[PDB]
């Protein structure tokens, strides 16, 4: 009794869901294997989604769910609590032998509005789970994580004035966690993305006392009618002014 103020907290549930989906994805990878990457990716997406939706209905039956892998009935627009999930982020990388740059994203949005609780699993990295309740708090040259598939064109403009080495990595979750780890200084994206790509990484980023915003510096906004959310900057706080400034100056 009195577990907090099964019965998990929202953050504990986010972490457990991310880990559980992580393990299932690892099982799918081992069972289906890499002969047909399309088949492997589809199975991972579908099975992880099924697990997550089943558990969210069982354990949070009153909460809305927005998932990449399910139809969106928009009931969430009237809810005060919405899980925003990417059952497998970096499906491409998951489907490729030896790649560890893929993730599970589990975010809870609560009306106010904020991502209040979140977890990001990197299942191939020992199924590590970064979570909002346990994550902790000028360089002459910047390492910036960018998509290994569709890197943002805006990076080329800012590189005229800032010394930057782009670090190509798959998955939004993997790139955001690379910022937390200190493997890169920043993660920059533009050109398109969805709420579930950034919601859990943003929640973790902000809980770590780091910076997460749109490229124009405005807050990342979630549970919108159109869950397209095309650009982001996630980085150490001190680096934010430098990069947001360069982005802004690119429009001069
Ligand atoms: N230009 C884009 N438009 C829509 N979604 C994207 C775009 N670039 C990346 N994403 C998505 O963002 C996530 C991370 O992609 P990446 O960083 O390319 O591995 C994946 O779910 C991608 O499908
Ligand atoms: Mg996708
Ligand atoms: Mg996905
Ligand atoms: Mg994704």
- Quote the CA–CA distance of 26 and 224 in Å, as a whole number: 32
Residues 72 and 144 in one domain: no
Q: How far is CA 106 from CA 58, 89, 157, 202, in A?
A: 16, 11, 33, 11
φ, ψ for residue 27, nearest 5 deg: -65, -45
Burial class (CB in 10 A: 0-12, 13-18, 19+), 60: middle
- To one decimal place, what's the resolution in Å? 1.5
Decide which of 133, 149, 179 is a domain's last residue: 133
Cα 244 to ligand 4 centre (Å): 24
Residues 109 and 149 in one domain: no
CA-wise closest residue to 221 among 77, 76, 114: 114
Decide which of 98, 117, 133 is a domain's last residue: 133
Residues 10 and 128 in one domain: yes
Decide which of 107, 133, 159 is a domain's last residue: 133
**Residue 1 counted as domain residue:** no
Residues 120 and 55 in one domain: yes
Residues 144 and 230 in one domain: yes
Instruction: Specify the residue for token string 């990878």.
Output: 29
Query: How many C-beta neighbours within 10 Å does residue 41 have?
Result: 21
- What technique was this entry resolved by? X-ray
**Residue 151 counted as domain residue:** yes
Ligand 1 atom nearest the C-alpha of 146 is 17
111 CB less than 6 Å from ligand 1?
no
Burial class (CB in 10 A: 0-12, 13-18, 19+), 143: middle
Nearest CA to ligand 1 atom 9: 193
Any known ligand binding at 63? no
Nearest-5° Cα angle at 177, 208 to 137:
20
192 CB less than 6 Å from ligand 1?
yes
Q: What is the DSSP letter of 162?
A: S
Ligand 1 atom nearest the C-alpha of 190 is 1
Residues 100 and 148 in one domain: no
Residues 197 and 224 in one domain: yes
Residues 75 and 175 in one domain: no
Residues 46 and 113 in one domain: yes
End-to-end CA distance of the chain: give it in Å, rounded: 60
Residues 207 and 138 in one domain: yes
Q: Please give the tally of structural domains in the chain.
A: 2
- Pocket test residue of 155, 197, 229, 230 for ligand 1, highest count of atoms within 8 A of CB: 197
Any known ligand binding at 149? no
CA atoms 211, 186, 208, 113: torsion sign: positive
**Residue 51 counted as domain residue:** yes
Is residue 69 within 8 Å of 49, Cβ to Cβ?
yes
Residues 237 and 208 in one domain: yes
Any known ligand binding at 231? no
| Boundaries of domain holding 50 | 6-133
């Amino acid at each position: 009794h009195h577990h907090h103020h099964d019965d998990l907290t929202d953050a504990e549930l986010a972490a457990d869901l991310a880990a559980d989906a992580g393990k299932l994805l690892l099982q799918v990878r081992a069972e289906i294997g890499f002969d047909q990457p399309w088949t492997l990716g589809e199975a991972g997406d579908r099975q992880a989604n099924s697990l997550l939706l089943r558990r969210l209905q069982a354990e949070r039956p009153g909460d809305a769910v927005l998932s990449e892998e399910a139809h969106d009935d928009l009931a969430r627009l009237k809810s005060d609590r919405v899980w925003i999930i990417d059952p497998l982020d970096g499906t491409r990388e998951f489907s490729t032998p030896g790649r560890d740059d893929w993730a599970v994203h589990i975010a809870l949005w609560r009306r106010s509005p904020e991502i209040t609780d979140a977890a990001v699993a990197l299942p191939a990295r020992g199924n590590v789970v970064y979570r909002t309740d346990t994550v902790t708090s000028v360089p002459g040259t910047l390492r910036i994580a960018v998509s290994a598939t569709r890197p943002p064109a805006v990076l080329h403009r800012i590189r005229q004035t800032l010394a930057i080495q782009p670090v190509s990595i798959g998955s939004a979750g993997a790139k955001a966690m690379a910022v937390i780890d200190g493997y890169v200084d920043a993660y920059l994206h533009a050109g398109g993305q969805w709420e579930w790509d950034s919601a859990a990484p943003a929640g973790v980023m902000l809980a770590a006392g780091m910076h997460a915003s749109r490229l124009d510096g405005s807050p990342l906004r979630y549970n919108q009618l159109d869950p397209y959310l095309p650009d982001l900057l996630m980085c150490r706080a001190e680096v934010a002014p430098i990069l947001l400034g360069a982005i802004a100056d690119a429009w001069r």
